[PDB]
RNA sequence: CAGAGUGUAGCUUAACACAAAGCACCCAACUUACACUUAGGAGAUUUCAACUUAACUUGACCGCUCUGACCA
């Protein structure tokens, strides 16, 4: 399962303190990952740029 | 003329890999202002940590054990299959022994901690990527 | 040709969703491993920054303190919420539908009439000359109730093998039984539709396999179809 | 000596594989697959190199030859969310992501379903598997390029 | 004044000597051994012995290792054994388990280290 | 001119045809432990233990002495395995075992050794100081 | 259900007794990882009797695999 390797530490000899950090995908799937402040959640957000031109067209009042 | 002979002495150069990051330690990490107090530990709590790991061992020998018995169940039930097949129908298995050609390649991403939410509308944004460049000069 | 019937089988999975919930022993090693990690680690830029206000206490421009961060960060994630692990599949048993059960591994289970019987088995098809039993498998899924599922086939090689005799009506020198060859597939995308659920089809763990199968076919079932 | 019965009693070079002191290319016959790239990419570096060890470790009880274990170059991106009532994007939080490749050869056709099986169950949440068949173009991906060699060309 | 079996220095370990302590270390148990450069054994103390195993947690630890050498010391003073030589690997030498059970024979009486022969 | 070897040739088990999958050693004290095994097995060709070793009577020694004591191994082994899970219960003896100030009390060790092992590493020792070559030939 | 063989933990024609052994395994540290090495971890005679003894020979007992029947 997925704990088969899931518990770990970082191995580094030096390395800064990491913060468990929920990361909200942009489906709103959340995953444990490592940050480097004492964040509670992160949200990675859909990026305009790769929406397409007609899109963009009628999507920019939708926008507003 | 002279162009070719350039062209042939220009892979003289060997190639060189790409540095990782992850591997070189940041020099901010050198300053001894960021160092932990290094507090030592009480006696009970090393007793706790060492029960612990005993527990550890034994019980990632028996989740080892699993996956090992997992595995030859089913290289059992395949091995079987093949056979019978033969058997059955010795063209049909010269088949299923060949190599599958649009297996690869094979994507598969790690299950997530929480389902997607349906109606949720992430803060737009633009991800900005600092990747460094490394040429080779000779 | 034989009294062999060669039926090829599709042991559709649908690979857990969402990560398995730690176990005690796992509960207590992932806190002492966190615990070591922040032992061995070096002051993080967030927590210098705590201690020079510290400092300001002592004696005594961000307006803003480490802690006061911290407190605004909580609020957030408090004001989000998390999609439910446990669905509101698990509550009503819903077995015909893929949320249930989502830190689980499910199989897919048909009922099929064989001999005037309901009996559940995995979708499978009959052998037809000129394709691989392979190419059976994949056939099973397009021979279905109305969906959209799409499958990744793992390799060629069948994964088990049943074989059934009928009774002794039925059984005769030119039909004596079938051999129905198991070809593991994961479920990439799509389900049944809803014109399609009406029923015959159930999503069970491991576990539940038996509780639908038969005796003799749920023991060759379960060698394959994975526990983890 | 030569004529004795015990002639060669000592000889070991055959016993051991001969090794010659810009790289072949390696394929698969018709029931086993060439050399391949287990792609272990995830945000978080520990569980990257924590499936990558598990994977290694796993091919080893299988007796399946891994090539190679290494890491890919780190991938940095800022997520710069919009400022509420604001026009202009702020950095909101810094994302690494990090690769670990372990190189395996050998695979059998028949005992890929089952080695993918239990590489595939076992992986942990956030972290991305992706199994290529090696090729030329993803070796010459971990060298630097020639900017200079380019403008020639 | 009995020779020892001088030469093999091309190989490991070497032969000369009268008597050696051989320390064989297996996943479930510790054995020592005192023989004679003719391969006979003098005296031995194992972890597999009863009167061993019944006063040790652990038959394969640092502890067992000790154990086995303060017993070994003792059996090898009953036995006129004060000399012998011990010829370990790198690692075995550095190992936390070998130098307690050295320890062990030191203190007990023997000397670990043979006299040179007397040539003249 | 060549003479067809007088025996098992070493190394000849050993398949050749597949080198790159058979298990290496890996380890000095793995290929050792081999080693050794060997050189003790009797080989045609020869070897320093022809020479330098003792040669003595293949048939076996006469026993004269009394005879064994007879053990129930069923009872005997059924007692020892609930001595050691006792030992092993307590919780002292394996903080003592952990932080290795533990230690085995010498003399019911001994008392113990001369009931048990004690009588043949005797005769062992009789064996090596040449006492029974001497007194019972 | 019936017949047949079969039984030490994963393997072993390990086990004379003085003893359930050797190796294969699991964790931690080292190693990018592996490997090595160090320091730790888990353990089996299916069960009960049969003449002293019996992991071993006898019977039952239980498990195991195989074959046939039942068997859509
Ligand atoms: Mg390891």
Known sequence: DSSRASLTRVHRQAYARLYPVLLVKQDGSTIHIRYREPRRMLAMPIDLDTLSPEERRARLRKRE | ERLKRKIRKLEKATQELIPIEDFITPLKFLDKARERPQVELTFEETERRALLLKKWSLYKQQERKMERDTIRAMLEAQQEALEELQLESPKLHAEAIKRDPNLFPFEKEGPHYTPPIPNYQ????????????????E | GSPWRLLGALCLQRPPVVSKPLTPLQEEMASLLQQIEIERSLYSDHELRALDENQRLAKKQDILLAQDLEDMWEQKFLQFKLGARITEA????????????????????????????????????????????????????????????????????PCGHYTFKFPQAMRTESNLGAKVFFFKALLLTGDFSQAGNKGHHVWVTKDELGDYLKPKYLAQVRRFVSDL | ???????????????????????????????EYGVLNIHLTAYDMTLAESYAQYVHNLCNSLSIKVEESYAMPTKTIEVLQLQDQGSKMLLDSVLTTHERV?????????????????????????????????TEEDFKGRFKARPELEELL | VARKERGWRTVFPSREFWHRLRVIRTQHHVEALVE???????????????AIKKHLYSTRNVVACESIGRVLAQRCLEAGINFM???????????????????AMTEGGVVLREPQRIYE | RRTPPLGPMPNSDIDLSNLERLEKYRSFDRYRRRA?????????WRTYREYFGEKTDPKEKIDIGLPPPKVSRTQ????RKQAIQELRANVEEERAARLRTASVPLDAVRAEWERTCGPYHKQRLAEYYGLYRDLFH
């Open chain 3, 90 to 157: 698990d509550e009503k048993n819903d077995r015909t539908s893929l949320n249930r059960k989502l830190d689980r591994n499910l199989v897919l289970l048909v009922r099929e009439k064989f001999g005037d019987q309901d009996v559940w088995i995995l979708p499978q098809a009959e052998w037809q000359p000129g394709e691989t039993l392979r190419g059976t498998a994949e056939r099973t899924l397009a021979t279905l109730s109305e969906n959209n599922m799409e499958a990744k086939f793992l390799g060629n090689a």
């Open chain 6, 76 to 79: 005997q082994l059924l007692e």
């Open chain 2, 122 to 137: 992430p803060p737009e944004g633009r991800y900005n990527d600092i990747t460094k460049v490394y040429t080779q000069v």
């Open chain 5, 85 to 103: 030589v011990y010829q370990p690997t790198p690692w075995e030498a550095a190992s936390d388990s070998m130098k307690r059970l050295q320890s």
């Open chain 4, 1 to 31: 000596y030569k004529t004795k019965p015990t002639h060669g009693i000592g000889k070991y070079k055959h016993l051991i594989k001969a090794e010659e002191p810009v790289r072949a290319i390696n394929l698969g016959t018709d029931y």
């Open chain 5, 36 to 50: 004679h450069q003719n391969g006979k054994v003098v005296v031995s103390a194992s972890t597999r012995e009863w």
């Open chain 4, 102 to 134: 372990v190189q395996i050869s050998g695979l059998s056709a028949t005992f890929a379903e089952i080695f993918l099986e239990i590489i595939q169950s076992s992986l942990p949440e956030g972290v991305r598997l992706s199994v290529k068949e090696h």
């Open chain 6, 36 to 44: 050794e095994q060997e050189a003790q097995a009797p080989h045609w």
